[PDB]
Design a protein around this ligand. Structure first.
Ligand code: MN
Ligand code: NA
Length: 622
């Protein structure tokens, strides 16, 4: 197709699967233009077949890139370079003409709400990375669909990558292959480009057979151009470009433009003993219990929880005013450590087959191991750590990396919701905010209004986790659990959320805030959690139904005395678990005030400032 005076623009002869001729016009140009830049040795157009999948895994195996886990059905283990183990927020940038479209201008001068880079600066960064980056490697072309095919809310992308690990994982986490290209036709697609940044011959040493370029790692988003461009990292959040990059950052901006929402929320369906089912969404920060909640095993008899998704929601008010949500993903990319029969039995049943593990320990009989797995091993069974060394319980360091993962098909979840792929989405009746707060924040409260509910989201704070580069357990702001993921100005995001109240016939969800992670004076968890969280969901259910089970406090509604079912617990310290201290909350509100003044400033909606003033006043009166 392409004109040329010589022979170095048409890449037809380097195609090892599929055809550039069979590709839609704009797809061909996208692939070929980037082939000209990156200079791959081969181009593989992914078809999404099981044959393609097994053969690629086998190839990675023979190359030492992955290992087969012999104990399980079609399960695999990758060990990364220790420099490439999580998201890096400081190297995650969005490109816009004006900085203020991307982040509010902070009064202090350092934004905690995203990272902006000028188009001039990015072009320099791009030219210093991508030319020739795929030399000696295969460029895989991944046609992928976010959302279930046929969904009005579904969006398709093309990811170019030089990483087989990215291909395999994208097969799990998205709908990918030939049928997606057929669905696309001559339509629009998000342009996604990824490279590990290690052209052959290697100029730097390879660590644990894991190609990466930590020094040059850059995860860039160009909303105007509809492009995502990621360099130097193979880790999930950095490399699986449909997930955080498209489904959150790109899509949140599109959402604001088009009147819907793209959120860091799980979706679950809960059924009560009276035969009633409601769908709930929940925004918790990374590694703060979303996956546990999404596929929870309720301890309360007659209650059932079913899973729609554990990470991302795309939501839109329909003509009927119902807030309808879909899961854009096709799998779960869940945190491994802490996963056990005790904490998450439904996950355990999911990850036994067709699952890729990254940075977990391996047992000598070909099984997986991590901190908190709560399964003893037979005598004689030994452990190889994520660092490919022999590991024993007394080794000081963990057998698995704290941010190690499973990447597993959603269809395999034993309690996957019957409607998890329904084109119309599911109706959300309650939205839950929450994070890790060791002190001051009660087990559960309910917002006083939509506007107060938006403030509660905006005010969210949670302990730092291992999901990114932030060390320790320092309590950080994480509004709407979206801090690492805003595709545009957080102030405008708040305004967008607030605008939902004025939408025709809108049936606004009840908004709650939970704290599973409150500790007492000597650092013990006040709440058993996991399956016991069904007791809090029960109370939320009744509140949505309009049950008179609430008591007014300065921070919102809490359960009345004896309103929460605590049967089979009994020892629970309800005094301090539900306690609200004037002193803590005076401190809390002043901290929120200063944060919003600094970080949001001229872009802070009046309604949010008003809620802040109201809360300060309610506290001053207690
Ligand atoms: Mn997440
Ligand atoms: Na490896």
């Amino acid at each position: 197709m392409p004109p040329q005076l010589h022979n170095g623009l048409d890449f037809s002869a380097k195609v090892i699967q599929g055809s550039l001729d069979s590709l839609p016009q704009e797809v061909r140009k996208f692939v070929e233009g980037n082939a000209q830049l990156c200079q791959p040795e081969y181009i593989h157009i992914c078809d999404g077949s099981e044959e393609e999948y097994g053969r690629l895994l086998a190839h990675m195996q023979e190359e030492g890139v992955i290992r087969k886990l012999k104990k399980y059905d079609n399960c695999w283990l990758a060990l990364t370079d220790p420099r490439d183990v999580a998201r890096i927020e400081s190297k995650t940038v969005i490109i816009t003409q004006e900085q203020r479209d991307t982040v509010p201008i902070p009064k202090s001068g350092q934004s905690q709400l995203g990272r902006w880079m000028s188009e001039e600066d990015f072009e320099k960064a791009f030219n210093a990375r991508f030319p020739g980056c795929m030399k000696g490697r295969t460029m895989y072309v991944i046609p992928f669909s976010m959302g279930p095919l046929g969904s009005p809310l579904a969006k398709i992308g093309i990811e170019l990558t030089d990483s087989p690990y990215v291909v395999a994982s994208m097969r799990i986490m998205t709908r990918m292959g030939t049928s997606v290209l057929e669905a696309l036709g001559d339509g629009e697609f998000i342009k996604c480009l990824h490279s590990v940044g290690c052209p052959l011959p290697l100029k730097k040493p390879l660590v644990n057979n894991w190609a990466c370029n930590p020094e040059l790692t850059l995860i860039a988003h160009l909303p105007d151009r509809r492009e995502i461009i990621s360099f130097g990292s193979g880790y999930g959040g950095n490399s699986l470009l449909g997930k955080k990059c498209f489904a959150l950052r790109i899509a949140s901006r599109l959402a604001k433009e088009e009147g819907w929402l793209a959120e860091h929320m799980l979706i679950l369906g809960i059924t009560n003993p009276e035969g009633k089912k409601k769908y709930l969404a929940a925004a918790f920060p990374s590694a703060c219990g979303k996956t546990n909640l999404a596929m929870m095993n309720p301890t309360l008899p007659g209650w059932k929880v079913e899973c729609v998704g554990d990470d991302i929601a795309w939501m839109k008010f329909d003509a009927q005013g119902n807030l309808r949500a879909i899961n854009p993903e096709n799998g779960f990319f869940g945190v491994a450590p802490g996963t056990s029969v005790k904490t998450n039995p439904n996950a355990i049943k999911t990850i036994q087959k067709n699952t890729i593990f990254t940075n977990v320990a391996e047992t000598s009989d070909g099984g997986v191991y991590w901190e908190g797995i709560d399964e003893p091993l037979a005598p004689g069974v030994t452990i190889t750590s994520w660092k490919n060394k022999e590991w024993r319980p007394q080794d000081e360091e963990p057998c698995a990396h704290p941010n190690s993962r499973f990447c597993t098909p959603a269809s395999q979840c034993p309690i996957i919701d019957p409607a998890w792929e329904s084109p119309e989405g599911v109706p959300i009746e309650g939205i839950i905010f929450g994070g890790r707060r060791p002190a001051g924040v009660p087990l559960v409260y309910e917002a006083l209004s939509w506007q107060h509910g938006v403030f509660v989201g905006a005010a969210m704070r949670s302990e730092a986790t291992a999901a990114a580069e932030h060390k320790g357990k320092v309590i950080m702001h994480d509004p709407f659990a979206m801090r690492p993921f805003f595709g545009y100005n957080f102030g405008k995001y708040l305004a967008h959320w607030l605008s939902m109240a004025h939408r025709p016939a809108a049936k606004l969800p009840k908004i709650f805030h939970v704290n599973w992670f409150r500790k007492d004076k000597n650092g013990k968890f006040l709440w058993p959690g996991f399956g016991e969280n069904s007791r809090v969901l029960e109370w939320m259910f009744g509140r949505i139904e309009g049950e008179d089970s609430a008591k007014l406090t300065p921070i919102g509604y809490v359960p009345k005395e004896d309103a929460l079912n605590l049967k089979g617990l009994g020892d629970v310290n309800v005094e301090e678990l539900f306690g609200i201290s004037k002193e803590f909350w005076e401190k809390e509100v002043e901290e929120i005030d200063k944060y919003l003044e600094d970080q949001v400033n001229a872009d802070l909606p009046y309604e949010i400032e008003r809620e802040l003033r109201a809360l300060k006043q309610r506290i001053s009166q207690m």
